[PDB]
Design a protein around this nucleic acid. Sequence first.
DNA 1: TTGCTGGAAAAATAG
DNA 2: AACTATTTTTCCAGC
Lengths: 281, 281
Amino acid sequence: KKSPMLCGQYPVKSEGKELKIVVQPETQHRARYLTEGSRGSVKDRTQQGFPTVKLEGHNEPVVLQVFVGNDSGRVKPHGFYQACRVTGRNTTPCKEVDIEGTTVIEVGLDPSNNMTLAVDCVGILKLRNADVEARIGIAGSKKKSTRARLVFRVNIMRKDGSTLTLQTPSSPILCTQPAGVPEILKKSLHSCSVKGEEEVFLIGKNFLKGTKVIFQENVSDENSWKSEAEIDMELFHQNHLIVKVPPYHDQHITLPVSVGIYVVTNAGRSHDVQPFTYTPD
Amino acid sequence: KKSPMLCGQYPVKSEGKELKIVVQPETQHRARYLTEGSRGSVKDRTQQGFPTVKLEGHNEPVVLQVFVGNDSGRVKPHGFYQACRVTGRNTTPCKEVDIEGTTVIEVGLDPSNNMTLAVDCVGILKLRNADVEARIGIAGSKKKSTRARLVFRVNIMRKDGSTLTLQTPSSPILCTQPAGVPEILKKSLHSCSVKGEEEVFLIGKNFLKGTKVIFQENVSDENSWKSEAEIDMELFHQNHLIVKVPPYHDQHITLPVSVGIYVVTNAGRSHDVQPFTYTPD
DNA sequence: TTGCTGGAAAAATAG
DNA sequence: AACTATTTTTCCAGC
């Protein structure tokens, strides 16, 4: 690498060459801390591969550089995150160099693979605020950012001593720890008359801000009658919640109907379903 | 202040002068982080005044120094706590100087008030691990102390260039957050047969490690039949808990008996009582 | 017995 | 000021 300042303005394509991101990285990747183990490379959005960058308009071996930059605007290396290498008996080999104090990961883009590479060797390291705080004061109430972009860039050298610098940043990635699926561990009531209205205490975990309690007949994705039970907000809690039993659709059943309850969180659905029996009026 | 090393050995009285603590500080004062907006001074044991120090055997204006030191032994400034000034339209004015890296608060002791002062301008700041690292060493920041003493000391200058240094440390003060009073906000069952055994979901707050759920008949301190309800440990939580209804003492009541439920925490008792009705078999 | 994560408690900050 | 709610960091525990 020629080491052109990381802060300079550079184009994605030029002189008949483009550095494009074929496969964007996941929208979220939990950064790891120095005090703990490694946490893995950054995957793609299907979690089944890795962000993939391609270099069209050129067919020679060229080192690809990667580093973690701010989440938006003019590309600057992020101030709270540092890129890091991820070793593995299947991961692409790479070097870990330091530029202007920020860590940059050098991988090798090659024509033997049509100038394409699935970056599977880059992880994100979280720097401690307090630590950053006492170096760059401008970073704190001025800005504590938890989002970052994977910054890719190639430094080709033209015929003379010149060097063309193509750079392309990915979509932002939220670098914190994911919500975790909702779960119901135990409910206080398992049976109620068809008119409902009786309260049910639910204790479990991960009841996020956008959670909903759903009373359903079966597991008919398309429709087997479902209904949002009203939640008590004056006592909402990530681990417990009080909901009122929604009245059943058939006020005139002759026999007890067994239905299921499960919760939806802005992040997912409590895959384990609770049984609840509606009984005639 | 002459700035004599904070670690030196100094007497309380000497040369016909004593620096005595008339009113010891509270046995507990919740330290606050520097980011914390709240700044209370350290009160006395009646919570109605402040620790008061007096300088007998001298009648001139002399600056009184205060700083937070270890909880016992040879006075050394505490490594996890720093003294801090507390401003107020009624609090005594003072300066905040730094000595050997520790913060010292300078107040003015004066004869116009018979060499006495009720230090109402000193608070205690809790140092965050990362701060304690840069101050007292990494391995040191592991040996945790949550107790500290308010260290008072005067630096009088004798006729010549000499300086007499009287120092007196207070009783230790606990600087951790004072556990809270338990509370029951809502229960799922309010009535049960005399034999009991039915579970009751309790959601409230501050259900500490040593909490007990008590079913009682009245508010007869001495005795009006009380009983610890069994708690489910596999789901214990500071804000909620599942207990089984203890069977009543009179398996043969003819009429429904109304009893109360309240919780005891290693720190106190949920003063607000919940009603529960036992019903005949 | 150490390394990779998912889960969380504890530490610090926000509102 | 005194609380309550969120975030950040540091710990744990299960392969």
